[PDB]
Homo-oligomer: A and B are copies of this chain.
Amino acid sequence: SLRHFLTLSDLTKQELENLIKRASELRKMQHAGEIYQPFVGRTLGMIFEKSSTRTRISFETGMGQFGGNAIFLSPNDTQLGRGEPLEDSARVISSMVDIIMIRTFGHEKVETFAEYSSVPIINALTDDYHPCQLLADMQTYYEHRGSIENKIVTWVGDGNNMCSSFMQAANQFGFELRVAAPYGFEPDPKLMERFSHCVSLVENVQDAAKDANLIVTDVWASRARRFAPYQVTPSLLDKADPEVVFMHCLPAHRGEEISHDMLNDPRSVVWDEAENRLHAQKALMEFLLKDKIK
């Protein structure tokens, strides 16, 4: 019975498509001022082993809009140490709240937390995978261009940040991914091989962009010499499908800014990427607690 969201594949292809569609409907409802409160009396526990303000604000805002409450556990509040400290945090917190989101770095830590939880666990982000941001990215594409099935997606930059999430998503959402990575900054071959069905490595960014429906990048405006040809410009977007949309990993560290040209370009959906963390996560919480609804 008890379903978690630890990795993207914990939902079937159809559940993922229904979720993104549901997130778009929840976004229209909130903006139209509809009151939808299926979680009156319900509580979200938010466990942050490492801080993410974007995660925290979006989850807290979401559960509130649904009539529930969110409990913010900051790193040095509760014991996340491997062993009993982890498993006892899980059983006790889940006897009190109805759903838990966790931000940790152990991929084995989130699995152990889940095993001892009586309630659904959401893995918001780990150090390797960003499943909540990836859901928000797929919602944003869907809202501007419909279904991404059999579309072409071009990742521009290294194998860090959301690269692995996009590679993982290719198979699940049914798209073709090209990774345009600078020489010496390619993803792990072992990863490439895992997703070799849907994903290909392409040095030439101009060729990778050809016929792309979505261009997504973690390359920050100005190592810098090596990334300079991987800077996404209006010029690069001109080589894509005329229906191309542009996404950019949102700023994570000081100095990371996206050019005005790319934010203001009419093909850019960066601001929806950030807002849709709210709506995509509401769709996810609604899905995991649906047997508590109505």
Contact = CB atoms under 8 A, between A and B. Distances in A.
A69 interface: yes
Contact of A95 (B35, B43, B51, B275): B275
A138 B173 CA distance: 53
Interface string A27-58: 00010010111001101010000010110011
A125 to B, nearest CB: 17
Contacts of A35: 40-41
A92 interface: yes
Nearest to A260: B84
Stoichiometry, as copies per complex, reads 3
A60 interface: yes
Given A53-B78, A64-B69, A65-B43, A96 B37 contact: no
A294 to B, nearest CB: 11
A159 B77 CA distance: 27
A292 interface: yes
Given A33-B292, A78-B53, A278-B96, A43 B64 contact: yes
Given A30-B41, A77-B53, A95 B61 contact: no
Contacts of A73: 53, 57
| A: interface residue count bin | 35 or more
Interface in A2-24: none
A288 to B, nearest CB: 16
A41 B274 CA distance: 20
Interface in A136-185: none
Nearest to A292: B33
A91 B271 contact: yes
A67 B254 CA distance: 36
Contact of A37 (B41, B43, B60): B41
A59 B169 CA distance: 40
A96 B33 contact: no
A262 interface: no
A275 B92 contact: yes
Contacts of A95: 271, 274-275, 278
Contacts of A69: 60-61, 64, 69
A57 to B, nearest CB: 6
A234 B81 CA distance: 28
Contacts of A68: 64
A40 B60 CA distance: 14
A129 B31 CA distance: 34
A274 B61 contact: no
Given A53-B77, A71-B61, A275 B96 contact: yes
A97 interface: yes
A35, A60, A96: which has the most chain B beta carbons within 10 Å? A96
